[PDB]
Structures are given as structure tokens and as C-alpha cells.
Design an enzyme around this catalytic site. Structure first.
Site, short mmCIF file in Angstrom:
data_model
loop_
_atom_site.label_atom_id
_atom_site.label_comp_id
_atom_site.label_asym_id
_atom_site.label_seq_id
_atom_site.Cartn_x
_atom_site.Cartn_y
_atom_site.Cartn_z
N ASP A 57 0.83 -1.23 0.00
CA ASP A 57 0.00 0.00 0.00
C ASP A 57 0.86 1.27 0.00
O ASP A 57 1.90 1.34 0.67
CB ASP A 57 -0.90 0.07 1.24
CG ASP A 57 -2.01 -0.98 1.28
OD1 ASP A 57 -1.77 -2.12 0.85
OD2 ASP A 57 -3.08 -0.66 1.80
N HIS A 59 -1.16 4.65 -0.41
CA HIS A 59 -2.15 5.61 0.12
C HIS A 59 -1.68 7.07 0.06
O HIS A 59 -1.66 7.79 1.05
CB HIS A 59 -2.55 5.22 1.55
CG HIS A 59 -3.49 4.06 1.58
ND1 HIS A 59 -4.68 4.06 0.88
CD2 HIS A 59 -3.40 2.84 2.17
CE1 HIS A 59 -5.29 2.90 1.06
NE2 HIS A 59 -4.53 2.15 1.84
N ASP A 85 -4.09 0.11 -3.75
CA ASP A 85 -4.34 1.10 -2.68
C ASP A 85 -3.34 2.25 -2.80
O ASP A 85 -2.58 2.55 -1.88
CB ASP A 85 -4.31 0.50 -1.26
CG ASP A 85 -5.64 -0.10 -0.86
OD1 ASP A 85 -6.47 -0.28 -1.76
OD2 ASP A 85 -5.85 -0.42 0.31
N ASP A 88 -6.24 7.68 -1.45
CA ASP A 88 -6.94 7.89 -0.18
C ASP A 88 -6.00 7.99 1.02
O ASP A 88 -4.89 7.46 1.00
CB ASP A 88 -7.96 6.79 0.12
CG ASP A 88 -9.12 6.78 -0.82
OD1 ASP A 88 -9.46 7.84 -1.38
OD2 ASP A 88 -9.73 5.68 -0.98
N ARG A 89 -6.45 8.71 2.05
CA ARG A 89 -5.82 8.92 3.36
C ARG A 89 -4.62 9.85 3.33
O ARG A 89 -4.55 10.76 4.16
CB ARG A 89 -5.42 7.61 4.01
CG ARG A 89 -6.60 6.66 4.19
CD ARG A 89 -6.39 5.68 5.35
NE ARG A 89 -7.56 4.80 5.56
CZ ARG A 89 -7.75 3.66 4.90
NH1 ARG A 89 -6.86 3.26 4.01
NH2 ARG A 89 -8.82 2.92 5.14
N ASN A 117 -8.57 -2.31 -2.96
CA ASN A 117 -9.96 -2.02 -2.69
C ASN A 117 -10.21 -0.51 -2.69
O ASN A 117 -11.37 -0.11 -2.83
CB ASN A 117 -10.46 -2.62 -1.37
CG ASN A 117 -9.62 -2.19 -0.20
OD1 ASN A 117 -8.39 -2.31 -0.25
ND2 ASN A 117 -10.25 -1.68 0.85
N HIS A 118 -9.16 0.31 -2.58
CA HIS A 118 -9.37 1.75 -2.72
C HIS A 118 -9.40 2.22 -4.17
O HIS A 118 -9.70 3.40 -4.41
CB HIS A 118 -8.33 2.54 -1.92
CG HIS A 118 -8.67 2.56 -0.46
ND1 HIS A 118 -9.21 3.66 0.17
CD2 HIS A 118 -8.65 1.57 0.46
CE1 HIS A 118 -9.45 3.36 1.43
NE2 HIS A 118 -9.13 2.09 1.64
N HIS A 166 -4.17 -7.90 -3.86
CA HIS A 166 -4.19 -6.90 -2.80
C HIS A 166 -4.64 -7.51 -1.48
O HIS A 166 -3.95 -7.37 -0.45
CB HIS A 166 -5.13 -5.75 -3.17
CG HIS A 166 -5.20 -4.69 -2.11
ND1 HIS A 166 -4.13 -3.89 -1.80
CD2 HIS A 166 -6.18 -4.36 -1.23
CE1 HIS A 166 -4.44 -3.06 -0.82
NE2 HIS A 166 -5.70 -3.30 -0.46
N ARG A 214 -14.05 -6.00 9.07
CA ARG A 214 -14.29 -4.88 8.17
C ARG A 214 -15.75 -4.76 7.76
O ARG A 214 -16.15 -3.71 7.29
CB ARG A 214 -13.46 -5.04 6.90
CG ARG A 214 -11.94 -5.00 7.12
CD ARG A 214 -11.32 -5.24 5.76
NE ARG A 214 -9.89 -5.47 5.84
CZ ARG A 214 -8.98 -4.51 5.67
NH1 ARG A 214 -9.37 -3.27 5.44
NH2 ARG A 214 -7.68 -4.81 5.73
N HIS A 241 -2.66 -4.76 2.05
CA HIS A 241 -4.01 -4.52 2.56
C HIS A 241 -4.06 -4.36 4.09
O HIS A 241 -5.06 -3.85 4.62
CB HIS A 241 -4.94 -5.65 2.04
CG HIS A 241 -6.41 -5.47 2.31
ND1 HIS A 241 -7.09 -4.28 2.10
CD2 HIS A 241 -7.33 -6.36 2.76
CE1 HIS A 241 -8.37 -4.46 2.41
NE2 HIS A 241 -8.53 -5.71 2.82
MN LIG Z 1 -5.01 -0.16 2.08
MN LIG Z 2 -6.55 -2.27 1.39
#
Ligand SMILES: [Mn+2]
Ligand SMILES: [Mn+2]
Length: 291
Positions: A57, A59, A85, A88-89, A117-118, A166, A214, A241
């Protein structure tokens, strides 16, 4: 003008973290459209060969992405597989995905990106990428990225022995042909094989398949991994992930590894990032990036 894009993205090397690179809208739209057609021309289940660097990841931690290339070697000096991923964040998702897409276009046979998944509109609407696009560009450009994310490949097998994705395994995954028959573009569904590949987690306390905290997909135990590797004549699952303190972390007597490449993840954790090198004899080693 792909070399100018890469040059301006790399200019902020060695700078204090946070300095933006603001490409033009037309440049960014160009990156999505050309990378999208490359993704669709290539298989959804990639067949890769060592030597390869594998990264988890990011991000939007763009200065840590630059650090990874500094340690691993900037393309084309090394071949890369990223596990998803990208956005995001973090504060710089746009710089991150833009450099990754630029490298995919320039080195399309030696640079590879899986879907995390992002890389899904409904998720990155919640977790910051929509807001970043709206503020710095506009919503139509975010929709352009979405159409591009919807075409990313989902899994990779390196030298017929390392299965990469992922998230993790799926109870619906019986044969690799099921992954190959996933049609793109598609959004990630709320359940089923594509969801699980992007969302599932190993769990040391579950035997078989468990509920995932989750609220999406499943957890799977060490026996699921051992059965999967034996059934498909594989040596290793490589996934991302989940943040792990040392940047990589083994599971199931080293039959699965979790890779995470964003050090000091979203400021809240004090984790290292790691990058996995696979050489031509399928030996794996790790380069560590401390916070
Ligand atoms: Mn992630
Ligand atoms: Mn993830």
C-alpha cells in the site's frame, strides 16, 4: 509529453514532504486514457517473471513512493509490481497515482499495477481521493480516474509460483480461470470473488473462513493457505491490505507474506515500509524503509 510529466513529478525529490506537483488537467486525463487502454490490452491475471520488486500500500504518501524508487531503483532500472491502494488517506494521492500511471505507460512490459480495494469510486469517495480531485481539479477528472481504476488487473502470478493480489483468498476461488473470466471494466461488487480478492485478510485465530471485522468479505486461516498452495502448485501468497509493523510479515509458516510500503502510515502508526525483491531463482528478500 510523458518525459516532461515524469520530470516534473520527480523534481520534488529530496524536498520536505508535502510540496505539491500540480500537472495540467489535460496531462492527467491523458495519463488515465492511455494507461486504461494498456490495462485492457493486458490480462486481468498477470503472468510475470522475476526479477521483480513488489510493493504494497502507498495511500497517497507520495514522498514515500519516491523513497521506494530511491531504494529499489527508478524504472527502468528495476521492474515493479504494486499491489494496490494507491490513493486515499494521504495528502498526495494525485501525485502518487500520476507517477504510477506515467511509469505504466512508459514501461508497459516492466511496470505493473494491481487493483486495491481503494481503486473503487464508492470507497475513495469516502476516504479522500474524491475530495482531492474536486479541490485541485474537478469531479469529471475523478470520474476519469474511476473509469481507469475499473480496468486495473486483479492478480498476478510470478514465475508460476507466487500468487499476488491486494487482499487475499476467496472461498469462491476454485481455479485461476475464474479470475481470467472477470470482465472489465467493472466496479467491485459487495460480495463474491472480485470482492474477496481485494478485501479478505488472513487471521491467526480463524480455522477455515471467518467473518471479517471490516464488514466486507472474509478472514481465512493458515489451513486455507496451505490447501490453496498445494492445490495450485504455488510456493507463496504475496498480498498487502494490512499495515504491519516491520513492513512485511509472514503468516502460515512463511506460505503467505503481507507487504506494506507506506512508512509511518497516515501519521498514526510507527511502522516501517518494505519492498520485496524476487530474483531469477525465486529467492525473496526485503528492503526496509524506516519512518
Ligand atoms: Mn489499504
Ligand atoms: Mn486495502
Amino acid at each position: 509529453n510523458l518525459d516532461s510529466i515524469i520530470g516534473r513529478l520527480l523534481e520534488v525529490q529530496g524536498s520536505r514532504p508535502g510540496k505539491n506537483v500540480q500537472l495540467t488537467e489535460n496531462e492527467i486525463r491523458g495519463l488515465c486514457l492511455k494507461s486504461r487502454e494498456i490495462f485492457l490490452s493486458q490480462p486481468i491475471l498477470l503472468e510475470l517473471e522475476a526479477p521483480l520488486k513488489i510493493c504494497g500500500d502507498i495511500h497517497g504518501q507520495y514522498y514515500d513512493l519516491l523513497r521506494l524508487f530511491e531504494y529499489g531503483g527508478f524504472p527502468p532500472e528495476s521492474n515493479y509490481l504494486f499491489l494496490g491502494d494507491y490513493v486515499d488517506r494521504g495528502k498526495q494521492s494525485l501525485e502518487t497515482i500520476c507517477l504510477l500511471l506515467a511509469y505504466k505507460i512508459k514501461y508497459p512490459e516492466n511496470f505493473f499495477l494491481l487493483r486495491g480495494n481503494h481503486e473503487c469510486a464508492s470507497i475513495n469517495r469516502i476516504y479522500g481521493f474524491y475530495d482531492e480531485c474536486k479541490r485541485r481539479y474537478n469531479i469529471k477528472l475523478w470520474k476519469t480516474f474511476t473509469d481507469c481504476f475499473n480496468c486495473l488487473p486483479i492478480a498476478a502470478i510470478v514465475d508460476e509460483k507466487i500468487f499476488c493480489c491486494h487482499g487475499g483468498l476467496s472461498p469462491d476461488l476454485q481455479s485461476m480461470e475464474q479470475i481470467r473470466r472477470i470482465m472489465r471494466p467493472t466496479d467491485v461488487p459487495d460480495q463474491g470473488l472480485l470482492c474477496d480478492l481485494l478485501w479478505s485478510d488472513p487471521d491467526k485465530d480463524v480455522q477455515g473462513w471467518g467473518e471479517n471485522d471490516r464488514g466486507v468479505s472474509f478472514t481465512f486461516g493458515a489451513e486455507v493457505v496451505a490447501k490453496f498452495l498445494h492445490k495450485h502448485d504455488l510456493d507463496l501468497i504475496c498480498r498487502a491490505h494490512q499495515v504491519v509493523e516491520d513492513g512485511y510479515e509472514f503468516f502460515a509458516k512463511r506460505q503467505l507474506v503481507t507487504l506494506f510500503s507506506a512508512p509511518n502510515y497516515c501519521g498514526e502508526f510507527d511502522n516501517a515500509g518494505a519492498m520485496m525483491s524476487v530474483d531469477e531463482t525465486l529467492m525473496c528478500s526485503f528492503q526496509i524503509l524506516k519512518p
